[PDB]
Design a protein around this ligand. Structure first.
Ligand SMILES: Nc1ncnc2c1ncn2[C@@H]1O[C@H](CSCC[C@H](N)C(=O)O)[C@@H](O)[C@H]1O
Ligand SMILES: [K+]
Ligand SMILES: [Mg+2]
Ligand SMILES: [Mg+2]
Ligand SMILES: [Mg+2]
Ligand SMILES: [Mg+2]
Ligand SMILES: [Mg+2]
Lengths: 137, 150, 326, 85
RNA sequence: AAACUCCAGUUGACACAAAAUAGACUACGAAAGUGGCUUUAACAUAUCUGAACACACAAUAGCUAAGACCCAAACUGGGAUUAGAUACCCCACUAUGCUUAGCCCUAAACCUCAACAGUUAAAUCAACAAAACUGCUCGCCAGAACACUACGAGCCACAGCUUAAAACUCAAA
C-alpha cells in the first residue's frame, strides 16, 4: 500500500492498526525538552498517567541534567515503567528544543516501546507574552 | 570569493533538491539524507550522521554518487566530482572508539624565577664582599638658493 | 598602639576553648594571641614568627605563661619541620590564625627600613638577621636587571609604571648604591614630576607617598611572602584538625587572592578579577575541579568598621576570611 | 482547543523513527517554526528585528541576483573553440 | 547557589496583556506612527509658497489620579562571580510598559535629501553619500571652543523644555 505521513483522522475508519488498537487509542508519550531538563510521561488515551520520568528523577543533577545521555536514560526508565503496565506502541508528542528532544525518543526505543507517530507540540506563542531580555554576554 | 560562495550555495541547493525528490532514486529518497555542508574547491559534501544505518547510508551514497553527478550534469552542467563526507561529529572519536573496542588490553607559583634572582643577589653580595622634533613640512630647502645663485 | 584589626571577630571565628591546640603563624606583636589567652587560659597556643624580636615577645609571653604558649622562630617553610619536631606531628590543630603584612614593632623601627617616613638601611627584611645571607632590599634593587625589577614591581607591587620606575632605579643605582630607604623614596619621586609625589591616594582616599607600592613590592620579594604564605597554608591544612577553624587576615589583593583560591580550591594560574562574561567565554572556548575541602564560616569577607579605620588606618584594607577544614 | 495529533504530526514508516523525526524537523524548518522559537527565546527589540529583516531581504535579493548572474555566465564555461588565437 | 516544593507533567476550564505565518508585501498617514477580526465613522484643498512663538499634532521615557496586572522590568533584596564593591549571570519583586482623564513636548523625531514646478542638454561632477541641475518661495548659517550654557522671557513644565548670548582663550576647529 501507499504510506501517507499524515496521521489517520479520528472519526474516520482507517485500516491501520497496532496490536488490534486504533490510532485514537494508542497511548501518548509526552516529552518536554527544556534547556536544563527533560521530562517524559506516558498516559493512556483516556489521560491516565502510566509512567513518568525525568533527568532529575534518574539521579542526574544540575548541569548534568542537560546532557542528551540523561534524556536517553529518562526515556529508558519511562519505557520500562510503561512496558511494565502493558504499553507497547506509543505516539510521541515532543515540545521544546532541549538537547534531549531526540535522545528521549531513542531511550524509549531502547526501552522496548514502539513509536508509531512523532508529534511536535512546542508551545509557540502567536505574539503572546513578552519574553525576557537578551542576555548581555 | 563571493562568487565561489554563491556557487557553493547553489550546489548545496541542487544536491538537497536531488535528495528530496523520489525521481532520482527510491533508495536515496527512502534514506532521507540531509546535508550539513557543501563546498567546492572537486566538491566536498558533508551530511549529518545518525552505525549500521550510517554504514548503509554511506554505502548507498557511494553507489549513487555517479548517478548524482550525471543528474547534476543535466542542470551548472560542468560539475566536478562530488565527495560525500560522513559527519560523525568528530569522526576521530568514532574511529577511536571502534578501534578501542577492537583493540586488546591484555589481563586486567609566584610567577617569577625567585631562585635565579636569589642566585644573582648572592653573586652581587659575593662580588661586593624629551627634546623638540621639527615638523617634516617646515624643513628648509636650499636647492632654490643654489639654483638662483648659479 | 595599632590594635589588632578585627581581633574580636578573630576571637569569635576561632572560638578558643580549654584544651585546644591553636597555631598563630604570625604572632608578631601578639595582640591576637593576648586576646585569645584572655578568652581561654588553658588553651595550648603556638606563637610562630620570623622576627627575632617577635620570638623575644613570644618568650616574654612564655614568661607570663610557662607552657600554655610555646614560642617558635622561623619561616612558614620551616614551620612544617619545626612543628613536627615540636610534638604536633599528627597535626590535629584545633585552630589556626594567620595575619599578614608588617608588624607594628617592625614598621615603627627605622633600622629595619620598613617605612619610607623614617630613614634607614634599605633592608625591608622581616628576619632580623637570623640568616645574614638572606638578601636585603638594597641588594635586590642594586642587583636585579631592568626587566627583572620591572617584573617584580609589576607583579608583586601592582604597579602600572614598572617600565619607568625600574629604569629610574637602575639609572640612580648606576651612580650610587641605593642603601637608604629615604634615598630610594627620593629616587622613585624623581621618576615622576614632583607634583606626583602624593597624587596617588589610598583606598581611604587619603594621599600617600607614590613610592609606597614599590616599597611594598620589595618587602614581598625580600620575604617571598606569596610562596611562603602558600607553603604555610598547605602546612596548616596538613596539620589542621578536621573541623578546625582557620582564620586569615589579608591586607592586600595578592595575598587575599591566594588565600581565597586556596580555600575554594581554585587554580592559582587562573586569570584575576574574572567576570561572569569572561567565564562564559572561557567555557564556550573550552566547550568545543578538585573536590571541596573547606566550609566557609563567612561566605563574604569581613572588613573593619569606619571607626576602626579611623583608629588604625593601616588596617583599613584588611579583609578577614574564616573557614573550617573539611 | 484544536484537535490534537493533526498539526506537526508525522507517522513513523516501518518503525523508522529517525527518518520520521528528520521529516518533522524539516517540515518545521521549512515553515520557519524552529527559527521562530529560537528568536522568541529572548525578546528581539523592534529596531533590531527590522534591521535583521531588512538585512535578510537584501541578502536574499543579492544572492538570487548573483546566482542568476553565475548561471548566465557559466554558459560560456566550455572548451575554447579558437585555441591558439 | 539561592529560590519554589500545592512544585512539575497530562487533561479541562480560563485575560482590561501581546497581536506567529501572511510580510520575499512596500501599503496608509502630515509627521510621530500604523501588520489579530468585525462594524460604524473616516483619510483637507481644481495654483503653489507661507510660522521656535499663532492653530493642531508629536515615539520612547516621565509626571498626576483611578483601575488592571499574564509577562517583561529600571530600582531594591538575595545568590553567584570578583582581592572587593558595583556591573555582566540567576532568582524574587516595584515604579513602569496596559486602560481612563489630564500633563510633559524630547530623539541618530534620519530618506541626516526643505516645499512646489521643470530638465536630462551642456561642464556630469571637489570628495564621499544618493546622477547632475534650473526656476521660485520660506526657514536657517557666517572660525573653533565657551554653549542642547549664563541672563531675560514663555510654558500645567519646578534637577524641566523652547529661544539663546558675552568675557577670557586658541590658530586653528
Ligand atoms: N613566612 C613567615 N614566617 C614567619 N613569620 C612571618 C612570615 N611572614 C611574615 N611573618 C611575620 O608575621 C607578622 C606579620 S604582622 C604581625 C601581626 C601580629 N599578629 C600582631 O600582633 O599584630 C610579622 O611578625 C612578620 O615578621
Ligand atoms: K513578519
Ligand atoms: Mg501652504
Ligand atoms: Mg509625547
Ligand atoms: Mg507592576
Ligand atoms: Mg523614526
Ligand atoms: Mg517648508
Amino acid at each position: 500500500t501507499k504510506f501517507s505521513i499524515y496521521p489517520p483522522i479520528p472519526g474516520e475508519e482507517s485500516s491501520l492498526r497496532w496490536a488490534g488498537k486504533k490510532f485514537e487509542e494508542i497511548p501518548i508519550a509526552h516529552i518536554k525538552a527544556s534547556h536544563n531538563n527533560t521530562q517524559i510521561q506516558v498516559v493512556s488515551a483516556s489521560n491516565e498517567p502510566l509512567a513518568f520520568a525525568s533527568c532529575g528523577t534518574e539521579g542526574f543533577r544540575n548541569a548534568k541534567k542537560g546532557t542528551g545521555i540523561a534524556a536517553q536514560t529518562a526515556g529508558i526508565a519511562a519505557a520500562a515503567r510503561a512496558k511494565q503496565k502493558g504499553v507497547i506502541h506509543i505516539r510521541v508528542v515532543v515540545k521544546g528544543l532541549g538537547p534531549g528532544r531526540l535522545s528521549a525518543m531513542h531511550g524509549l526505543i531502547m526501552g522496548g516501546l514502539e513509536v508509531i507517530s512523532i508529534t511536535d507540540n512546542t508551545p509557540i506563542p502567536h505574539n503572546g507574552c513578552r519574553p525576557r531580555k537578551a542576555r548581555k554576554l | 570569493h563571493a562568487r565561489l560562495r554563491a556557487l557553493n550555495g547553489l550546489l548545496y541547493k541542487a544536491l538537497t533538491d536531488l535528495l528530496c525528490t523520489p525521481e532520482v532514486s527510491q533508495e536515496l529518497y527512502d534514506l532521507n539524507v540531509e546535508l550539513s555542508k557543501v563546498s567546492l574547491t572537486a566538491c566536498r559534501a558533508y551530511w549529518k550522521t545518525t552505525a549500521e544505518q550510517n554504514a548503509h547510508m554511506e554505502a548507498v551514497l557511494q553507489r549513487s554518487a555517479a548517478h548524482m553527478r550525471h543528474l547534476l550534469m543535466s542542470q551548472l552542467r560542468n560539475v566536478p566530482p562530488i565527495v560525500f563526507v560522513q559527519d560523525k561529529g568528530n569522526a576521530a572519536l568514532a574511529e577511536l572508539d571502534q578501534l578501542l573496542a577492537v583493540a586488546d588490553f591484555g589481563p586486567r607559583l609566584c610567577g617569577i624565577d625567585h631562585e635565579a634572582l636569589n642566585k644573582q643577589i648572592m653573586e652581587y653580595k659575593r662580588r661586593k664582599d624629551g627634546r623638540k622634533r621639527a615638523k617634516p613640512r617646515l624643513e628648509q630647502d636650499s636647492s632654490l638658493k643654489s639654483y638662483l645663485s648659479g | 598602639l595599632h590594635i589588632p584589626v578585627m581581633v574580636d571577630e578573630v576571637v569569635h571565628c576561632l572560638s578558643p576553648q580549654k584544651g585546644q591546640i591553636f597555631l598563630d603563624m604570625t604572632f608578631g606583636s601578639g595582640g591576637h594571641t593576648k586576646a585569645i589567652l584572655q578568652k581561654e587560659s588553658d588553651i595550648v597556643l603556638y606563637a610562630l614568627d620570623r622576627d627575632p624580636t617577635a620570638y623575644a615577645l613570644a618568650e616574654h609571653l612564655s614568661e607570663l605563661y610557662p607552657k600554655q604558649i610555646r614560642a617558635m622562630l622561623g619561616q612558614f617553610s620551616q614551620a612544617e619541620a619545626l612543628l613536627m619536631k615540636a610534638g604536633v606531628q599528627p597535626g590535629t590543630f584545633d585552630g589556626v590564625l594567620m595575619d599578614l603584612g608588617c608588624s607594628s614593632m617592625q614598621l615603627d623601627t627605622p633600622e629595619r627600613g620598613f617605612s619610607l617616613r623614617k630613614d634607614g638601611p634599605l633592608d625591608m627584611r622581616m628576619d632580623g638577621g637570623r640568616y645574614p645571607d638572606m638578601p636585603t632590599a638594597a641588594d635586590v634593587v642594586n642587583a636585579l636587571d631592568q626587566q627583572a625589577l620591572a617584573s617584580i614591581l609589576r607583579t608583586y607591587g601592582e604597579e602600572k609604571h614598572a617600565k619607568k620606575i625600574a629604569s629610574a632605579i637602575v639609572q640612580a643605582r648606576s651612580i650610587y648604591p641605593i642603601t637608604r630607604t629615604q634615598q630610594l623614596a627620593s629616587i622613585v619621586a624623581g621618576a615622576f614630576p614632583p607634583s606626583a609625589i602624593y597624587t596617588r591616594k589610598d583606598l581611604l582616599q587619603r594621599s600617600t607617598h607614590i613610592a609606597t607600592k614599590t616599597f611594598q613590592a620589595l618587602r614581598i620579594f625580600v620575604n617571598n611572602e606569596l610562596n611562603e604564605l602558600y607553603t604555610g597554608l598547605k602546612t596548616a591544612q596538613k596539620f589542621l584538625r578536621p573541623g578546625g577553624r582557620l582564620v586569615a587576615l589579608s591586607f592586600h589583593s595578592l595575598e587575599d587572592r591566594i588565600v581565597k583560591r586556596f580555600l575554594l580550591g581554585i587554580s592559582m594560574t587562573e586569570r584575576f578579577n574574572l567576570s561572569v562574561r569572561q567565564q562564559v567565554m572561557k567555557t564556550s572556548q573550552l566547550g568545543s575541579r578538585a573536590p571541596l575541602m573547606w566550609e566557609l564560616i563567612h561566605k563574604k569577607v569581613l572588613s573593619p568598621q569606619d571607626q576602626d579605620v579611623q583608629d588604625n588606618p593601616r588596617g583599613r584594607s584588611a579583609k578577614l576570611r574564616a573557614a573550617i577544614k573539611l | 482547543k484544536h484537535l490534537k495529533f493533526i498539526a506537526r504530526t508525522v507517522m513513523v514508516q516501518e518503525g523508522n523513527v529517525e527518518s520520521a523525526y528528520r521529516t518533522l524537523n524539516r517540515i518545521l524548518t521549512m515553515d520557519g517554526l524552529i527559527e521562530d522559537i529560537k528568536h522568541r527565546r529572548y525578546y528581539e527589540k523592534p529596531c533590531r528585528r527590522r534591521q535583521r529583516e531588512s538585512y535578510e531581504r537584501c541578502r536574499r535579493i543579492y544572492n538570487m541576483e548573483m546566482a542568476r548572474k553565475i548561471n548566465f555566465l557559466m554558459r560560456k564555461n566550455r572548451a575554447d573553440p579558437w585555441q591558439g588565437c
